[PDB]
Amino acid sequence: HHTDPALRALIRVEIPIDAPGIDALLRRSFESDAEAKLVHDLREDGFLTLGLVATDDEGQVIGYVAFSPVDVQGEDLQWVGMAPLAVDEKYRGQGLARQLVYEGLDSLNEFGYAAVVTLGDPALYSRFGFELAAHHDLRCRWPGTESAFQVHRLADDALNGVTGLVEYHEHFNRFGLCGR
Numbered sequence: 001h002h003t004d005p006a007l008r009a010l011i012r013v014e015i016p017i018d019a020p021g022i023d024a025l026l027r028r029s030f031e032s033d034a035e036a037k038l039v040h041d042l043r044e045d046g047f048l049t050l051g052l053v054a055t056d057d058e059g060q061v062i063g064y065v066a067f068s069p070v071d072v073q074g075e076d077l078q079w080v081g082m083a084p085l086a087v088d089e090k091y092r093g094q095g096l097a098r099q100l101v102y103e104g105l106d107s108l109n110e111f112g113y114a115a116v117v118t119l120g121d122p123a124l125y126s127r128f129g130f131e132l133a134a135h136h137d138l139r140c141r142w143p144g145t146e147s148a149f150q151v152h153r154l155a156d157d158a159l160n161g162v163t164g165l166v167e168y169h170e171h172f173n174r175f176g177l178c179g180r
């Protein structure tokens with residue numbers, strides 16, 4: 001008895017040739033082009049800490065997650081903010097977002113980062129281990145985010161004694177991003 005290998009998407013760090021595919025995915029996946037424009041600007045200016053792509057058998061980008069640096073109370077503690085996160089509508093419900101976030105966080109830990117923040121629906125991000133940032137006395141700069149701003153430590157004690165304003169790069173101060 002022979003079983004055909006199951007068809008699956010591979011996840012890896014993005015490379016330059018992926019940019020147009022990432023852009024197309026972001027434009028088609030969100031309600032506005034803000035996410036695509038954000039990623040373009042972060043990459044162009046050197047503030048995209050890490051990006052991971054999920055690709056189909058032909059190498060087409062079908063999923064994406066990115067991370068950029070954030071400071072806390074104006075200091076660099078090796079924290080990052082996760083955004084955006086997208087899976088092509090053709091591949092939704094297959095566990096690819098879960099995998100992208102897990103691998104992202106695992107890679108970040110491997111490379112010495114201490115925590116990851118994100119802004120979004122807690123009904124989604126809590127599934128991946130994120131906790132409400134307000135419970136740890138952490139906030140972002142935007143209004144109406146106390147229920148959506150979240151944090152995932154990468155070390156058990158990473159959040160202890162770390163409080164206040166978590167600042168994203170200024171490229172995030174554009175309108176229409178998910179979670180805002």
Ligand SMILES: *SCCNC(=O)CCNC(=O)[C@H](O)C(C)(C)COP(=O)(O)OP(=O)(O)OC[C@H]1O[C@@H](n2cnc3c(N)ncnc32)[C@H](O)[C@@H]1OP(=O)(O)O
Pocket residue numbers: 029030031085086087088091092093094095096097098099121123124127177178179
């Ligand atoms: S603010 C505008 C909102 N738009 C977007 O977020 C961008 C368009 N959406 C997407 O790209 C996808 O729908 C995302 C949000 C990436 C989810 O992709 P998938 O559904 O394909 O992800 P997985 O199959 O990896 O699922 C992992 C777990 O997440 C749960 N889940 C998916 N979507 C949601 C929403 N919207 N709300 C709450 N939970 C959600 C899945 O059920 C799954 O749950 P488990 O805990 O793994 O069972």
